């Protein structure tokens, strides 16, 4: 279970990273 | 949008509204009693409530 939570932390954090990365990729248009 | 006469009459109403947009005086306080006092109190409270409710109604009808 705790290994599921460790990979869950990896999951959510890489998710947030990629989301904000694309956010900046879009904000660079304007 | 609207039509030519629509905007033109709207400007007419705007002019006749800005002429009066000084501190207009239709708030009359002649209520001299406990009873007439409370009566005019309630009348004015409902008046202001309904004015500003028509206001937010216009707000919704425009947010449309």
């Amino acid at each position: 279970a705790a290994a599921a939570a460790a990979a869950a932390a990896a999951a959510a954090a890489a998710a947030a990273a990629a989301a904000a990365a694309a956010a900046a990729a879009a904000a660079a248009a304007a | 949008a609207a039509a030519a006469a629509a905007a033109a009459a709207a400007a007419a109403a705007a002019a006749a509204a800005a002429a009066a947009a000084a501190a207009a005086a239709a708030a009359a306080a002649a209520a001299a009693a406990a009873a007439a006092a409370a009566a005019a109190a309630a009348a004015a409270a409902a008046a202001a409530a309904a004015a500003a409710a028509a206001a937010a109604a216009a707000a919704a009808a425009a947010a449309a």
Binding site: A5 | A1, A7, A24, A26, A47, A51, A63
Partner: protein, 327 residues
Amino acid sequence: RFQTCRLLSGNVWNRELTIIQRRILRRLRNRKRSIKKRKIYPKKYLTSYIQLQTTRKLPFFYGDLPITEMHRGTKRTSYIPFLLNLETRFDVIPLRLYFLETIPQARQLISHRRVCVNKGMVSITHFKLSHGDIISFQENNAIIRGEEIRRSFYKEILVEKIIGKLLHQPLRMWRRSKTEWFHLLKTKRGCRLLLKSRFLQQLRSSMQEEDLERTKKFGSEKVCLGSSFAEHKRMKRNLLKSLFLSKRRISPIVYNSSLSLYSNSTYCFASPHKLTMKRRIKRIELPTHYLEVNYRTPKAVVFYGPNIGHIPHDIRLKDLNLLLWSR
């Protein structure tokens, strides 16, 4: 005059832009102001072009005096007669900075009417006054311009702004009639207080948010981060060490809460300014390097002189870094 805006390739604050003026400004502003200012790189003395544009913006701002001549009167370049005339020229600067149109509305006022200073009429129209000067209308001025400043502070800071920011994007010929209706509502001195107490609370919350936006612009989040440097590391410590303690050595809901609040920590302290905004309305920048008025009846004694970074420039910091070479 609007023709001057057309010349300046933009908007010199003509009042009551009629419909074809709306059209022509959209055309000129977008097409021309873009094409010239967007991507040209001309040898066409862009420095001197900018110079013309700014030295032409400023005179209408202060009515009609020639400001190249002000430059020339001294042997300096600039910024001194600027800080000076703005310390006061006494009708065009202060009367507008508080409540008027700097133009020959706020002029000729000192010519014929009175605004007695320290109860003393000073009818010269170019006075310089600082450090302890009481600015007061006459009473027969008051009995009208109290109402005028009220209808200003509301019809032109509440009504116009509120028909703005909303009701707006599809049709303006519609904000027209909405202004008619809200005029009928502002006719009412009870509606005044009810509006003081109305849902404008919501709009002020949203404004706080948008100021927070324009704040995060340049590192508000970075200083929030540095100021709460531990706390996020403390959350990470919670997570990782309670991991290497409870298991792999309530655990599931420890991971639930730790994940939620930690990811939310990182989100809120690293959201980088999704602006994408439609437009931007402008605030009225009241002077509190000068002292306020008894707004009831004008009694607005000054208390100090002005700075250079808090002035209503219709020009960005650039081109005024070419005029006023200041930090």
